[PDB]
Amino acid sequence: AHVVKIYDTCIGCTQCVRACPLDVLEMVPWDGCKAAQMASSPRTEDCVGCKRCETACPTDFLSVRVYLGNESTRSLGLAY
Amino acid sequence: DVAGLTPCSESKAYNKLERKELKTLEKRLKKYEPGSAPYLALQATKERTQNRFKNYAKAGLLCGNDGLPHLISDPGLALRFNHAGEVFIPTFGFLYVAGYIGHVGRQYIIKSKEDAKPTDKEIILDVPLALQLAFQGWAWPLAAIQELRNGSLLEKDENITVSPR
Amino acid sequence: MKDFTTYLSTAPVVGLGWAIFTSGLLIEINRFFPDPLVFSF
Amino acid sequence: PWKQPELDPDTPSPIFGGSTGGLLRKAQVEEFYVTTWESPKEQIFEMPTGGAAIMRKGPNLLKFARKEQCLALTTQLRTKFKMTPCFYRVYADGKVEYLHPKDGVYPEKVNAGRVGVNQNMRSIGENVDPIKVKFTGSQPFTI
Amino acid sequence: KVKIAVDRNPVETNFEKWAKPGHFSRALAKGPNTTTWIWNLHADAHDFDNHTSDLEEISRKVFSAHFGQLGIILIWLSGMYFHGARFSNYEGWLSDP
Amino acid sequence: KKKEVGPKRGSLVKVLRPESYWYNQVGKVVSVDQSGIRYPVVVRFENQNYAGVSTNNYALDEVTDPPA
Ligand code: CLA
Ligand code: CLA
Ligand code: CLA
Ligand code: CLA
Ligand code: CLA
């Protein structure tokens, strides 16, 4: 499966979760941002690597990162 | 006689090319009545060809084994053999015009970045300012080297965006 | 008028004007100086 | 949520004819996903596997071969009618796993109950060079 | 039932929108900041379905664009006939085609 | 807290973050968070990035006064 890594630069805007087409991200409580929210990836085995979460990230560079590798049936987006 | 090239005036193949062009021009000319517009156009073309072949001669031009003129490239060799105006002076004129264009564009960029929303001035040109800078660039090299001297031509690397290593 | 003047102040219009001016200058130079190759007088 | 709902295969399917982008042989060999919702009235929606279907007034159950189709239907129902659906995953042996509303409040919210995993406590670009992690099996972003 | 339905003067004939290049869409109404904006200005220029959601204004724009294309075609045809009139040998060709 | 945690609001700052798009660039301070978050300094830039945004959050150590 792919690797989804979320850093402390996230502002908890929940844009990456809304842009996620497979429900990989989530919001957890936090204290390092004004919104008191932090992105998490508890379902990274269902991610395909579409990088839609990175498109919705408003911070400079990327507070969420997707790294491809070790494709599976779920990661390849196969219905067969 | 440099580079094994004969001058165009003393060349042989140059005359063959001139006669061939005049011969095909006359062959095209003979198909029309003398009092016609195509006859006048072909006569003007023949006159222009003769004038071009005469002006390419008596100017230091050299051609080798095909009658097609060759341009002497190295300055000094071109300077001592009357070939400076082939490429040495045309690049000087081109450098003058290119520096004119670059200095005018640089002045427009600097003067347009001062006001609020400079992108609007970039995409909607200030025509009086552009024409004023157009007629003020005749001394571009003096101004360019003086901005080089006072350091306003160059920007410090601390203020320039740098890609990560 | 000033709206029309700012329309002519846009980049494609001044580009067309510059292109027309430069093309006309080069064409009239080449017509009145037929076949220039060697810088001599 | 407060109590995780259980999948009911006896719930009626929405009014729809035949399907071509539907279940392949992966459904009977590997897992397949099942989306359920509770329509308050009779209305026509668009399936992500083909044309249009009509959902029945009451419980509605649909089957898909991919989780992305289930979440696409979920977000279409949430944006169009504010339906709040939920989908399960059924394996070949019949194991049912609850997928979308893990805490029942949707991943846009927080609920103060989830634990943040796969999070790096350093800024991006502070990761070590690939020379630092060589012949070790650990990526610079995995530490 | 079928009748002419026409609104009188919905759009004022002014040059105020010629000064601002990006005006048909809200994305280009804020002005340019990157060069792709320029390409966008030349991409969504005649995408009238994206500028407004009203079908009436889209239909009016389509009608006027068709009139403009017909005017362009007629200008081209008039130019063809003018070139045949002056810079041509059509009369000479008629004798021995 | 005495004075403020960050720079003066509305003052120009230079971003020292190397991975940021606006490295060695000048921006304007919009707000500085007093709660104690990791990146409290909000900086707005005239030139947008490839994503189209123009505002970002930076820490105290990656912002300095612009050189003149
Ligand atoms: C019919 C004639 C003709 C035409 C159409 C061109 C066309 C072109 N030339 Mg060429 N050139 C010609 C004759 C011609 N050349 C001749 C006869 C010479 C002398 C032998 C040169 C020498 C020359 C050089 C050295 C360069 C060009 C460049 C260019 C291109 C871009 C010019 C530019 O950026 O805009 C106008 C210029 C600007 C907007 C910016 C100003 C930049 C200029 C070049 C600097 C001038 C001042 C500088 C300090 C002098 C030293 C130059 C340095 C290389 C040593 C363009 C395709 C440039 C190019 O292709 O770059 C990729 C370039 O660097 N030309
Ligand atoms: C007048 C503005 C201006 C100036 C001063 C420069 C200067 C420079 N450019 Mg740039 N460039 C410009 C405009 C300008 N460029 C534009 C508009 C483009 C898009 C086509 C580029 C694309 C470009 C590339 C892709 C490259 C450069 C490079 C260079 C360097 C080499 C010199 C040269 O002639 O390159 C040659 C430049 C060109 C061939 C571009 C010519 C584009 C048009 C024809 C000129 C525009 C003139 C402008 C409209 C005048 C405005 C006046 C105002 C009153 C309206 C130099 C630092 C090179 C570099 O990095 O070298 C270190 C390089 O690789 N430039
Ligand atoms: C009639 C249809 C038509 C056509 C064919 C074009 C074509 C063009 N326009 Mg557009 N435009 C149109 C209608 C049209 N426009 C309308 C109705 C509007 C609303 C008022 C605009 C507003 C508009 C803006 C605001 C700008 C353009 C620009 C451009 C250029 C795209 C950028 C480019 O070339 O790369 C980038 C090119 C360069 C960096 C080169 C710069 C230097 C060049 C050599 C000078 C320009 C000379 C030009 C190419 C020749 C005249 C135009 C030609 C169509 C006759 C291109 C020449 C851009 C532009 O000026 O780019 C040239 C630009 O900024 N247009
Ligand atoms: C980049 C390569 C390149 C180079 C170096 C040349 C160079 C040349 N070609 Mg070629 N050509 C090229 C590309 C090139 N061309 C391409 C791509 C094409 C295909 C489109 C052609 C097609 C072509 C043809 C069909 C012909 C040429 C010709 C020419 C000559 C033109 C000289 C001229 O006009 O007199 C010199 C002109 C000037 C110096 C212009 C004056 C400009 C200065 C700045 C003064 C400005 C005027 C004014 C005083 C300014 C003040 C007033 C102002 C404010 C209004 C020259 C040898 C002609 C020729 O004679 O061949 C030998 C010819 O018949 N070429
Ligand atoms: C009855 C004719 C007709 C009509 C009314 C439309 C209308 C429309 N089309 Mg369609 N289309 C047509 C024919 C037509 N199209 C045909 C025949 C094709 C096949 C090629 C297409 C392919 C097509 C695509 C792929 C797309 C559209 C889109 C659009 C919309 C916006 C177009 C726009 O803004 O372009 C603005 C104008 C331009 C960008 C200029 C185009 C210039 C071309 C690319 C190059 C010119 C070639 C020229 C002959 C050679 C130049 C040489 C050079 C030296 C000068 C609009 C709804 C777009 C859309 O968003 O739809 C909603 C879209 O994505 N159309």
Side-chain angles (χ1 to χ4, degrees):
Chain A
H2 300 336
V3 183
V4 179
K5 286 310 184 184
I6 297 150
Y7 307 93
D8 45 54
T9 68
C10 155
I11 58 183
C13 68
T14 74
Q15 284 321 109
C16 64
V17 199
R18 292 163 206 275
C20 196
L22 291 118
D23 193 15
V24 185
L25 297 328
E26 233 166 35
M27 311 303 288
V28 303
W30 203 37
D31 52 8
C33 89
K34 183 53 170 82
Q37 295 180 121
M38 164 81 123
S40 88
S41 48
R43 280 162 309 270
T44 187
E45 79 276 338
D46 285 343
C47 162
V48 302
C50 66
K51 314 257 201 167
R52 275 205 220 169
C53 51
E54 311 192 340
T55 316
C57 216
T59 80
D60 199 4
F61 202 178
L62 284 176
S63 298
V64 68
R65 218 71 170 85
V66 202
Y67 311 93
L68 305 314
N70 297 357
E71 318 264 354
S72 75
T73 317
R74 320 152 138 180
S75 175
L76 275 173
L78 303 188
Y80 44 87
Chain B
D1 63 324
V2 314
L5 311 178
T6 71
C8 288
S9 53
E10 329 176 350
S11 158
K12 203 51 91 74
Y14 186 78
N15 293 18
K16 320 304 192 193
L17 186 62
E18 197 197 343
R19 299 186 290 82
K20 193 173 89 64
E21 293 188 19
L22 288 192
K23 190 180 183 62
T24 180
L25 269 162
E26 276 142 30
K27 276 188 225 151
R28 257 167 66 82
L29 180 79
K30 85 159 58 177
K31 271 196 283 242
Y32 295 109
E33 293 178 351
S36 41
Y39 199 95
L40 289 188
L42 281 170
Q43 280 259 80
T45 312
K46 178 170 151 297
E47 188 66 40
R48 272 184 306 242
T49 307
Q50 281 173 336
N51 294 149
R52 145 165 37 85
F53 267 94
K54 190 183 59 178
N55 291 326
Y56 282 5
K58 48 96 144 178
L61 261 188
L62 316 177
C63 44
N65 311 340
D66 40 45
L68 308 159
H70 289 182
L71 260 55
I72 303 307
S73 195
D74 168 72
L77 194 74
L79 282 160
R80 83 155 41 87
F81 286 120
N82 216 29
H83 293 121
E86 269 172 4
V87 289
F88 183 56
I89 309 180
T91 66
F92 269 20
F94 185 86
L95 278 188
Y96 172 76
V97 182
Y100 205 126
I101 297 161
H103 174 68
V104 162
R106 171 158 213 276
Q107 278 315 293
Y108 192 83
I109 284 291
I110 292 172
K111 289 185 183 182
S112 100
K113 277 218 207 122
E114 323 187 330
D115 86 15
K117 206 136 175 80
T119 54
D120 178 79
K121 300 293 294 309
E122 279 212 3
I123 215 179
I124 302 173
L125 271 80
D126 197 21
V127 195
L129 177 59
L131 264 306
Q132 165 202 102
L133 292 169
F135 294 128
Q136 277 181 349
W138 299 93
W140 77 265
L142 302 314
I145 69 100
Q146 287 293 343
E147 315 164 306
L148 173 73
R149 207 142 301 246
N150 53 64
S152 87
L153 179 64
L154 270 206
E155 199 153 57
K156 328 283 296 308
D157 284 61
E158 314 97 81
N159 298 267
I160 300 164
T161 320
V162 157
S163 153
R165 303 313 182 216
Chain C
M1 185 61 9
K2 87 166 300 315
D3 282 338
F4 187 72
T5 326
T6 41
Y7 161 69
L8 315 162
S9 312
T10 53
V13 186
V14 296
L16 175 59
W18 152 84
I20 283 184
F21 161 71
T22 317
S23 319
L25 166 83
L26 277 170
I27 281 162
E28 288 259 66
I29 279 165
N30 255 265
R31 159 158 89 86
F32 279 101
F33 304 106
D35 317 299
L37 171 81
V38 199
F39 178 67
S40 272
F41 181 75
Chain D
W2 213 349
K3 193 206 61 52
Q4 157 180 341
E6 313 319 337
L7 175 56
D8 201 358
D10 308 356
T11 44
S13 212
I15 309 283
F16 180 68
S19 167
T20 318
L23 288 181
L24 285 181
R25 222 180 93 154
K26 193 194 158 187
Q28 51 245 39
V29 176
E30 308 172 66
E31 75 268 12
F32 65 99
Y33 305 87
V34 170
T35 318
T36 82
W37 59 98
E38 194 69 37
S39 181
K41 77 159 187 173
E42 267 267 18
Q43 32 187 70
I44 312 167
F45 71 105
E46 164 210 353
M47 275 184 327
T49 49
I54 316 176
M55 62 183 97
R56 322 192 181 226
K57 182 180 161 45
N60 282 298
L61 172 134
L62 254 179
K63 309 164 94 140
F64 301 101
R66 283 195 61 221
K67 198 207 188 185
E68 200 176 355
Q69 305 158 325
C70 267
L71 205 82
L73 187 69
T74 295
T75 189
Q76 173 200 161
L77 291 186
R78 281 182 68 197
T79 324
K80 222 155 282 182
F81 328 102
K82 303 107 192 172
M83 284 288 347
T84 73
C86 51
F87 51 88
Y88 315 83
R89 175 199 273 133
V90 185
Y91 290 93
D93 37 34
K95 169 160 125 61
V96 182
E97 175 197 356
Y98 201 64
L99 290 185
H100 190 15
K102 288 307 282 223
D103 44 352
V105 307
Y106 275 136
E108 291 92 21
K109 278 306 284 219
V110 296
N111 224 24
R114 335 177 164 142
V115 186
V117 313
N118 251 31
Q119 306 172 336
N120 286 340
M121 277 325 88
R122 81 202 159 272
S123 168
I124 183 174
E126 295 179 335
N127 310 328
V128 298
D129 293 50
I131 176 62
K132 289 305 203 184
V133 301
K134 242 210 164 189
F135 317 116
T136 46
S138 155
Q139 283 313 294
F141 46 85
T142 51
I143 47 184
Chain E
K1 207 164 283 183
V2 169
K3 71 185 174 185
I4 308 118
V6 153
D7 279 320
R8 296 199 292 235
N9 288 270
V11 181
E12 205 41 69
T13 309
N14 278 44
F15 277 96
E16 88 303 9
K17 277 184 178 180
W18 285 38
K20 326 167 184 28
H23 71 94
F24 36 77
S25 81
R26 276 97 44 81
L28 312 174
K30 301 184 299 301
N33 203 269
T34 40
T35 45
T36 88
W37 187 99
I38 299 153
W39 305 118
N40 291 326
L41 160 74
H42 284 53
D44 322 88
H46 304 152
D47 200 350
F48 301 147
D49 215 348
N50 261 8
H51 308 151
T52 36
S53 73
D54 170 51
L55 198 59
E56 186 168 338
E57 191 68 33
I58 292 169
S59 308
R60 291 149 172 201
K61 285 184 208 200
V62 163
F63 207 38
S64 321
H66 291 187
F67 272 120
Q69 174 82 327
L70 249 58
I72 283 299
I73 290 174
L74 282 162
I75 276 179
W76 158 74
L77 249 185
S78 66
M80 294 341 264
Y81 273 94
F82 198 91
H83 269 78
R86 190 163 165 94
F87 325 104
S88 163
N89 53 351
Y90 177 73
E91 292 182 349
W93 177 82
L94 278 193
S95 300
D96 201 1
Chain F
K1 314 142 168 60
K2 62 109 198 177
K3 205 245 161 224
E4 217 71 338
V5 51
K8 149 79 82 63
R9 180 194 248 98
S11 65
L12 298 168
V13 282
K14 170 195 185 181
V15 164
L16 314 151
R17 203 196 256 192
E19 70 260 14
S20 160
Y21 172 77
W22 294 284
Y23 182 48
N24 294 334
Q25 298 221 22
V26 186
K28 289 192 68 169
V29 170
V30 168
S31 64
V32 182
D33 210 318
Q34 314 294 304
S35 310
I37 66 177
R38 283 133 193 275
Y39 311 99
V41 185
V42 177
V43 194
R44 149 175 317 275
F45 303 91
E46 278 332 89
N47 44 331
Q48 82 200 12
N49 67 332
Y50 314 103
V53 316
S54 308
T55 46
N56 203 53
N57 302 42
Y58 297 99
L60 282 318
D61 39 303
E62 37 203 17
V63 287
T64 42
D65 320 270

